[PDB]
Design a protein around this motif. Sequence first.
Motif, mmCIF file in Angstrom:
data_model
loop_
_atom_site.group_PDB
_atom_site.id
_atom_site.type_symbol
_atom_site.label_atom_id
_atom_site.label_comp_id
_atom_site.label_asym_id
_atom_site.label_seq_id
_atom_site.Cartn_x
_atom_site.Cartn_y
_atom_site.Cartn_z
ATOM 1 N N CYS A 84 -2.791 0.010 -3.948
ATOM 2 C CA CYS A 84 -2.755 -1.049 -2.946
ATOM 3 C C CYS A 84 -3.013 -2.403 -3.588
ATOM 4 O O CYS A 84 -3.641 -2.508 -4.644
ATOM 5 N N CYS A 127 0.875 -1.164 0.000
ATOM 6 C CA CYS A 127 0.000 0.000 0.000
ATOM 7 C C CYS A 127 0.913 1.213 0.000
ATOM 8 O O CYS A 127 1.837 1.284 0.815
ATOM 9 N N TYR A 154 0.874 5.669 -1.035
ATOM 10 C CA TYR A 154 0.094 6.840 -1.402
ATOM 11 C C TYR A 154 0.966 7.831 -2.170
ATOM 12 O O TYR A 154 2.074 8.165 -1.733
ATOM 13 N N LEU A 191 -4.031 6.476 -3.992
ATOM 14 C CA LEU A 191 -3.559 5.338 -3.218
ATOM 15 C C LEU A 191 -3.440 4.129 -4.142
ATOM 16 O O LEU A 191 -4.354 3.849 -4.919
ATOM 17 N N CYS A 193 -4.936 -0.882 4.273
ATOM 18 C CA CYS A 193 -4.687 0.488 3.824
ATOM 19 C C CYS A 193 -4.910 1.436 4.989
ATOM 20 O O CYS A 193 -6.069 1.763 5.313
#
Length: 196
Positions: free
Chosen positions: A40, A29, A31, A38, A46
């Motif tokens: 993932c 995960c 960002y 994001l 997350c």
Amino acid sequence: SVPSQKTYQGSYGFRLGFLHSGTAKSVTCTYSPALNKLFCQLAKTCPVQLWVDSTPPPGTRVRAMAIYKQSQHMTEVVRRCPHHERCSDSDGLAPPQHLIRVEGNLRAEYLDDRNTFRHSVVVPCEPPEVGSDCTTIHYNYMCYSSCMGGMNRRPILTIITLEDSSGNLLGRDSFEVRVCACPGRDRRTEEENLRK
Ligand SMILES: CCN(CC)c1nc2c(C(=O)O)c(O)c(I)c(-n3cccc3)c2s1
Ligand SMILES: [Zn+2]
């Protein structure tokens, strides 16, 4: 009908925060601030931070909902694909059709909206633990962006809303999501595409 995605800090100064996980091949995960996106892996944790400038009233809640990012798909409900809705991966609380789950919170509630048919998951808004300055919710995304008959390669946004006990809006934030096998590589690729 389309839920609003307008960022709104509101009276409590509500906004999200994300960890700095990097883009190594092993990351599950990660960002991207430059993309507000994001990345993932399927069904992996997350962590999403919630930040406020002042404490909201008892009974305030935090809701998560996915919508398609492209306008021509925005009225379509985001749901799990025909395979994943049938794959018997229930946690005992999330309906098998819901894309977004909250991990490790027995007070999470899952809504099928009676009018829009959209899915959401909502939890009570808990103060930070002693020694912390924010609260974290752990979300899971239960289909890949590429799943045929579901998201089908269409990008989605997650909209996070801070709500009072009646469900009235107190604050809103949002981020794009890609659920994929190699989030570190895909984040690097998309950030390079943006730079170029
Ligand atoms: C309504 C309950 N309550 C009083 C005990 C809360 N206090 C906080 C505080 C704080 O007092 O500092 C905070 O920083 C955050 I971030 C919170 N939070 C949790 C999910 C969204 C916001 C809550 S909830
Ligand atoms: Zn799927």
